[PDB]
Structures are given as C-alpha cells and as structure tokens.
Design an enzyme around this catalytic site. Structure first.
Site, PDB file in Angstrom:
ATOM      1  N   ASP A 194       6.469  -8.249  20.128  1.00 14.27           N
ATOM      2  CA  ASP A 194       7.821  -7.666  19.816  1.00 14.27           C
ATOM      3  C   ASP A 194       9.526  -7.788  20.336  1.00 14.27           C
ATOM      4  O   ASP A 194       9.061  -9.133  21.119  1.00 14.27           O
ATOM      5  CB  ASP A 194       7.396  -5.587  19.777  1.00 14.27           C
ATOM      6  N   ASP A 196      12.556  -5.887  22.215  1.00  9.90           N
ATOM      7  CA  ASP A 196      12.583  -4.331  22.621  1.00  9.90           C
ATOM      8  C   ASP A 196      14.124  -4.302  23.198  1.00  9.90           C
ATOM      9  O   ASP A 196      14.572  -5.470  23.390  1.00  9.90           O
ATOM     10  CB  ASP A 196      11.997  -4.161  24.058  1.00  9.90           C
ATOM     11  N   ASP A 257      11.477  -2.063  18.705  1.00  9.79           N
ATOM     12  CA  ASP A 257      11.558  -1.194  19.169  1.00  9.79           C
ATOM     13  C   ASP A 257      13.019  -0.509  20.004  1.00  9.79           C
ATOM     14  O   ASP A 257      13.195  -1.389  20.673  1.00  9.79           O
ATOM     15  CB  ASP A 257      10.456  -0.749  21.607  1.00  9.79           C
TER      16      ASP A 257
HETATM   17  N1  DGT Z   1       9.560   3.000  29.936  1.00  8.72           N
HETATM   18  C1  DGT Z   1       8.994   2.979  29.296  1.00  8.72           C
HETATM   19  N2  DGT Z   1       8.101   1.726  29.842  1.00  8.72           N
HETATM   20  C2  DGT Z   1       7.245   1.155  28.796  1.00  8.72           C
HETATM   21  C3  DGT Z   1       6.260   1.729  28.235  1.00  8.72           C
HETATM   22  N3  DGT Z   1       5.133   0.836  27.162  1.00  8.72           N
HETATM   23  C4  DGT Z   1       5.705   0.225  27.801  1.00  8.72           C
HETATM   24  N4  DGT Z   1       7.224   0.542  28.819  1.00  8.72           N
HETATM   25  C5  DGT Z   1       6.785  -1.039  29.545  1.00  8.72           C
HETATM   26  C6  DGT Z   1       6.346  -2.399  30.637  1.00  8.72           C
HETATM   27  C7  DGT Z   1       6.369  -3.423  29.793  1.00  8.72           C
HETATM   28  O1  DGT Z   1       6.952  -4.466  30.602  1.00  8.72           O
HETATM   29  C8  DGT Z   1       8.330  -3.243  28.873  1.00  8.72           C
HETATM   30  C9  DGT Z   1       8.016  -3.854  26.685  1.00  8.72           C
HETATM   31  O2  DGT Z   1       6.616  -3.407  26.105  1.00  8.72           O
HETATM   32  P1  DGT Z   1       6.069  -4.423  26.177  1.00  8.72           P
HETATM   33  O3  DGT Z   1       4.947  -4.152  25.580  1.00  8.72           O
HETATM   34  O4  DGT Z   1       6.819  -5.282  24.472  1.00  8.72           O
HETATM   35  O5  DGT Z   1       6.209  -5.699  26.747  1.00  8.72           O
HETATM   36  P2  DGT Z   1       6.716  -7.216  26.897  1.00  8.72           P
HETATM   37  O6  DGT Z   1       8.245  -6.694  26.318  1.00  8.72           O
HETATM   38  O7  DGT Z   1       6.763  -7.550  28.330  1.00  8.72           O
HETATM   39  O8  DGT Z   1       5.695  -8.436  26.126  1.00  8.72           O
HETATM   40  P3  DGT Z   1       5.191  -9.085  25.067  1.00  8.72           P
HETATM   41  O9  DGT Z   1       6.193  -9.982  24.653  1.00  8.72           O
HETATM   42  O10 DGT Z   1       6.195  -8.031  24.200  1.00  8.72           O
HETATM   43  O11 DGT Z   1       3.591  -8.984  24.071  1.00  8.72           O
HETATM   44  O12 DGT Z   1       8.002  -2.019  28.873  1.00  8.72           O
HETATM   45  C10 DGT Z   1       6.609   2.963  27.769  1.00  8.72           C
HETATM   46  O13 DGT Z   1       6.579   3.852  27.244  1.00  8.72           O
HETATM   47  N5  DGT Z   1       8.284   4.046  28.180  1.00  8.72           N
HETATM   48 MN    MN Z   2       7.899  -6.686  24.262  1.00  5.50          MN
HETATM   49 MN    MN Z   3       7.813  -3.036  23.423  1.00  4.50          MN
END
Ligand code: DGT
Ligand code: MN
Ligand code: MN
Length: 333
Positions: A194, A196, A257
């Site tokens: 996704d 963010d 998001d």
């Molecule tokens: N404050 C908050 N942070 C979150 C929540 N869920 C996940 N996070 C944190 C941990 C993740 O590293 C980051 C964004 O979530 P993602 O699932 O999009 O992970 P990320 O973007 O690192 O990997 P991706 O390349 O999207 O697979 O935010 C939440 O409900 N609240």
């Molecule tokens: Mn992400």
């Molecule tokens: Mn996300």
C-alpha cells in the site's frame, strides 16, 4: 559485536542474506498464523540480525556469538548452507494451512483471527469467500473485488502519482496543510502492498474536518473505489482507501492509508507510521524495558511522573531515549 535491539543498529534496505532471512520469515509468518507470538518474534529477530550483517553467511561458523540466534534458527541456516533447502520451510510452503492463511490474510481487511475462523469453517479459496458474502465485511468485499490489483506490488511511480493527487486535494481543501509519505516507501523500499500518507497542518486544530474534504475532492475526480472513514477514538482520524490509479490505457486499484495527526503529535505519528513493524516493536520494547518510558504513535509518556515528552522531530525522540538517530532508510529491520 552487534547490538541486541534492532533500534540500536542500522538495518539497510538491501543486504547479503536474502535467501536466509526469507526462509526464517516464512517460519515467523507461519508461527503467527498459528497464534505462536513468541516463535514469531524469535524468527523475526533472527531474520533481522541477518539483514544487519555486512557480509553474506557462507559458513555456519559465521553465526558464532550473534544475538537472537537460538538452536532452531541456526538449524534452518545450517540446512540451507549444507543442502540448499530446509525441509521444515518447504513443508510449510506446501502446507494447505499456510497457503490458505497467506491467501486470506493478504486480503484487504482480513487479519489472522478472521482468516483462521474461515479456515476452521472449511473455506479455502477466494471463490469460497465470494460464495459466502454474508460472512464478509464491506471492506473485505472491496478487497475481494480488487484482489488481483491489490496483490500486484505497488511501485515507486505509483506512489509518486498518488502523492501528487493527494497533495493537490489537500492543498485545495486547506492551504498550508502538508502530506508526508510514510510507511515502507519512506524507508526507501522500491515496492509495497500500500501507500501510507500522514497529513497535518502547522496550526494545531486547523486539521479538523480536513480529511472528509480531501476525500470528497478525490471521490469527485473518480479516484476512489472504496473509502472507509473512521473518527479518532481516544485513535487518529484516518481513511482506509482503495484508489483507482490511472495508467496508460488502463488503471489499477491501489491501497492507500491517509492518516491525520495534529502537529503536536506529528513526530510520534511519523516515527510510528514509518516502521518497520519490527523496528517499532523493538523501539517500544527498548523505551519500556531500558528507559521506563511508554512510546506510541501519539507520544512518549513517563508513567511514574505522569508526564508527556515534548518532541519537535523524530531526532528529539531518539535523543530523549538515549539512542543514536537512525534515518528512515536504516529502519528496515
Ligand atoms: N500507529 C499505527 N501504526 C501502525 C498500525 N499498523 C501498522 N503500523 C505501523 C507499522 C508499519 O511499519 C507502518 C505501516 O504499515 P504497513 O502495513 O503499510 O507496513 P509498511 O508500509 O512498512 O510495508 P509495506 O511496504 O506497505 O508492505 O505503520 C496502526 O494501526 N497504528
Ligand atoms: Mn505501507
Ligand atoms: Mn498501511
């Protein structure tokens, strides 16, 4: 020596041990699917260590004196070094339980508990879910509708295009409001599941009612396939979206998001949302275990003094916790 916590060491985007860390992360994921939180964190920590190493692990003697490398994690690497394959990892890969849990949990809006419930109820395929729409939330319905696109990795060029439309909608709704790319793309990743974004305004409170205005604009341009707004309950105002991203001659659904934070909380929200998941888990364990402070995406609280830390930046937060600053591209734990 390499430090115990992932927040005390740089973990770059690219490394020398991708085969080994991938195997360990398959075991971590599968343990999470079985609710084995301990084994999940153990394999995840071991994988993260390999990612921080400056050289490839070619012999088992190189595991000597590494943190978070118990007997099980060592045996996995051993079998891979000696035989090119680890039997337990291959069994997991081919297991129906793992494949189904992976299939279901990858769907937008589906967590482990739901996926496991569906599994226990005899559901296996995406078609099985589509035959039981009474079992699906609206979010999950949208996830299924767009599952091909949502399993296509999101590219940096997609991110750039999306950030432009989000910045334009934000800028039109409220001059001075800012959009900050967070998540994996801020950590330097070339692809993701996704995009963010963290939205704020430098005057505290001017961000009130901004997100719904941004969404109206985006909706009016045909850019939104699915949108679920949630007001904060405490806990940030956010919108869970599927965007319709135009591309030459076609289009693709992309998960986005959009999170709004008041500027007083922005450094905390940025830190929390930038990740990685493990890095943030480790940073919060460090703050609690080592410093007695509770870190989250809204603040840093001293439970003994009943005080909140005032932070202007991410650097302030690291400084306050006694840690050397790690830029986002070294948080890929
Ligand atoms: N404050 C908050 N942070 C979150 C929540 N869920 C996940 N996070 C944190 C941990 C993740 O590293 C980051 C964004 O979530 P993602 O699932 O999009 O992970 P990320 O973007 O690192 O990997 P991706 O390349 O999207 O697979 O935010 C939440 O409900 N609240
Ligand atoms: Mn992400
Ligand atoms: Mn996300």
């Amino acid at each position: 020596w390499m430090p115990a916590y992932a927040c005390q060491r740089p973990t770059p985007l690219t490394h020398h041990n991708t085969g080994l860390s991938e195997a360990l992360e398959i075991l971590a994921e599968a343990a999470g699917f079985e609710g084995s939180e301990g084994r999940l964190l153990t394999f995840c920590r071991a994988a993260s260590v390999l990612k921080a190493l400056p050289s490839p692990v070619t012999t088992l003697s190189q595991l000597q004196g590494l943190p978070h490398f118990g007997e099980h994690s060592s045996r996995v690497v051993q079998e891979l070094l000696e035989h090119g394959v680890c039997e337990e990892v291959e069994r997991v890969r081919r297991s129906e339980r793992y494949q189904t849990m992976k299939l279901f949990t990858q769907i937008f809006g589906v967590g482990v508990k739901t996926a496991d419930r569906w599994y226990r109820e005899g559901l296996r395929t995406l078609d099985d879910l589509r035959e039981q729409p009474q079992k699906l939330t609206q979010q999950q319905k949208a996830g299924l509708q767009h599952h091909q696109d949502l399993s296509t990795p999101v590219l940096r060029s997609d991110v750039d295009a999306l950030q432009q439309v989000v910045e334009e909608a934000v800028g039109q709704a409220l001059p001075g409001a800012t959009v900050t790319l967070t998540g994996g793309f801020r950590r330097g990743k070339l692809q993701g599941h996704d995009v963010d974004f963290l939205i704020t305004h430098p005057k505290e409170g001017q961000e009130a009612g901004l997100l719904p205005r941004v969404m109206c604009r985006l909706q009016d341009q045909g850019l939104i396939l699915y949108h679920q707004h949630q007001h904060s309950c405490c806990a940030f105002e956010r919108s869970f979206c599927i965007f319709r991203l135009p591309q030459p001659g076609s289009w693709k659904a992309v998960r986005v998001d959009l999170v709004v934070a008041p500027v007083s909380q922005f450094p905390f929200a940025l830190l929390g949302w930038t990740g990685s998941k493990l890095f943030q888990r480790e940073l919060r364990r460090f703050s609690r275990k080592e410093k007695g402070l509770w870190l989250n995406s809204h603040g840093l609280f001293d439970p003994e003094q009943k005080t909140f830390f005032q932070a202007a930046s991410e650097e302030d937060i690291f400084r306050h916790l006694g840690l050397e600053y790690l830029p986002p591209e070294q948080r890929n734990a």
